[PDB]
Amino acid sequence: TKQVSWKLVTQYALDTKCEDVFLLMGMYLNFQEAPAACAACAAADQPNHFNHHEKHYYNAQIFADSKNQKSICQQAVDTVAAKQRVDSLHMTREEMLVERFNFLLDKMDLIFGAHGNAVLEQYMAGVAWIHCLLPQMDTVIYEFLKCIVLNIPKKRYWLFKGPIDSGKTTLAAALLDLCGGKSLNVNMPLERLNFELGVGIDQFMVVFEDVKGTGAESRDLPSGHGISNLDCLRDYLDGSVKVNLERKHQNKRTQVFPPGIVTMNEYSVPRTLQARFVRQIDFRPKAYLRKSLSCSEYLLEKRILQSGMTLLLLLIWFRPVADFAAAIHERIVQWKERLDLEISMYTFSTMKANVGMGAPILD
């Protein structure tokens, strides 16, 4: 009887950085149809479909006949988890960001390509908006990446502080998507905290999203455990010593907890937790930024401002090829040519001027 290559399914999971057994089962099954009569092949909607369709077609047909599909996908997903463990100990944090970048560029190459649906001019309007959020933004993003890559103890966490609709969440999300990693909710009590901090295992960075303090009901701020919990998580935030992180059906992982961001409202920060942050960026709602967005509907509809591709487009536009690792230089040059065709320094400056007047960014 015909036998499926577990090695080939693993290769596909490795190529797509697949961490989901059900999505792998689903993705691998869609390869069983003939590429000459396939709808998703000729339409070129997924890169993980037409490029791999030929390589996995025969194996996918065999797979469609397996009595043991879930096990095949479990070992593939486990090999992907096994790759990340080796990487976290033998890969330099620079090579870790190049990987993330190459991943974001594949998704970029797809959607802006002659078989994609996204509009590049709209993403560049996102870059305009983002570049208006803070002064020296392209340098603020570059200083963040240096900080996260270098991972220097006690100089690893940035604090984003401000009211709702100030840009703190959007930028933290954008950077989280830029570097790769997870967002964490430390508002739960110390008891259930342990399984939450375990989500941090093998992550390149974390965002402690919307951390809450107490005695701020008078400022219309809700109470939560987040601020006090963060004072107790000194070892995690400082990253001088390794910590024992827990998650279900697994021996508790030991590692230096990841660096990243903490976001919160205008709560008073305890003296001890304040010294844990190397930098603090204060965000305030600017009327021109909100009206601009209200006029540039596509930015919300397409989730452009929360996109890591948007911050990558920003770096490609503002920074020369030398500011990127040698491993993606040819990919940077290609994106630089493409962006040049769509926008210029004069038109970009006009987009920023349109943000400043709170008018639709694109005329």
List, as one string, the DSSP characters of 115-180. T----HHHHHHHHHHHHHHSTTHHHHHHHHHHHHHH--TTS-EEEEE--SSSSHHHHHHHHHHHH-
Q: How many CB atoms lie within 10 A of CB 102?
A: 13
Contact code string over 103-142 relative to ligand 6JG, x by CB under 6 A: ----------------------------------------
CA distance 79 to 236: 27
Is 166 labeled as ligand-binding? Answer: yes
Tell me which residues touch Zn ion (CB under 5 A): 35, 38, 40-41, 53
Query: Which residues neighbour 51 within 8 Å (Cβ) at sequence distance 6 or greater?
Result: none
Q: How far is CA 6 from CA 27, 28, 274, 304, in A?
A: 15, 12, 50, 37
CB of 174 to ligand 6JG, least distance (A): 10
CA distance 250 to 17: 21
Tokens describing residue 280? 């603090």
Residue 154 lies near ligand 6JG (rule: CB under 6 A)? yes
CB of 37 to a copy of itself, least distance (A): 18
Our CB check for a copy of itself shows the closer of 240 and 349 to be 240
Is 88 labeled as ligand-binding? Answer: no
CB 243 within 8 A of CB 255: yes
Q: Pairing mode, if any, of strands 260-264 and 253-255?
A: unpaired
Subset of 174-233 contacting ligand 6JG (CB under 6 A): none
Our CB check for Zn ion shows the closer of 41 and 124 to be 41
Among 52-60, 251-259, 320-328, 340-348, the segment contacting a copy of itself (CB under 8 A) = 251-259
Our CB check for Zn ion shows the closer of 38 and 221 to be 38
Subset of 40-99 contacting a copy of itself (CB under 8 A): 40, 45-46, 64-67, 69-71, 74-75, 78-79, 81-86, 89-90
Q: What is the CA radius of gyration of the chain?
A: 22
Query: Which residues neighbour 192 within 8 Å (Cβ) at sequence distance 6 or greater?
Result: none
Subset of 277-316 contacting ligand 6JG (CB under 6 A): 278, 285-286, 289-290, 293-294, 305
Answer with the entry of Zn ion, a copy of itself, ligand 6JG, none that 89 interacts with (C-beta below 5 to 8 A by kind): a copy of itself
Is 164 labeled as ligand-binding? Answer: yes
- The single-letter DSSP state of residue 206 is E
Subset of 96-125 contacting a copy of itself (CB under 8 A): none
CB of 162 to a copy of itself, least distance (A): 15
Our CB check for a copy of itself shows the closer of 203 and 354 to be 203
Question: Is the CA virtual torsion 347, 353, 355, 361 positive or negative?
Answer: negative
Our CB check for a copy of itself shows the closer of 21 and 312 to be 21
Answer with the entry of a copy of itself, Zn ion, ligand 6JG, none that 166 interacts with (C-beta below 5 to 8 A by kind): ligand 6JG
CB of 283 to a copy of itself, least distance (A): 15
CB 252 within 8 A of CB 149: no
Is 358 labeled as ligand-binding? Answer: no
Is 53 labeled as ligand-binding? Answer: yes
CA distance 47 to 109: 9
Q: Residue 14: name the closest of 82, 93, 67, 72 by CA.
A: 82
Subset of 170-229 contacting a copy of itself (CB under 8 A): 170, 173, 182-183, 187-188, 190-192, 199, 209-210, 220, 222, 224, 228
CA distance 320 to 217: 48
Helix (H, G, I), strand (E, B) or coil at 78: helix
Our CB check for a copy of itself shows the closer of 20 and 138 to be 20
Is 109 labeled as ligand-binding? Answer: no
List, as one string, the DSSP characters of 19-44. --HHHHHHHHHTTSS-TTT-HHHHHT
Footprint on this chain of ligand 6JG (rule: CB under 6 A): 154-155, 165-167, 170, 240, 278, 285-286, 289-290, 293-294, 305
Cite the annotated binding site by residue number. 49, 53, 162-169
Cite the annotated binding site for Zn(2+) by residue number. 49, 53
Cite the annotated binding site for ATP by residue number. 162-169
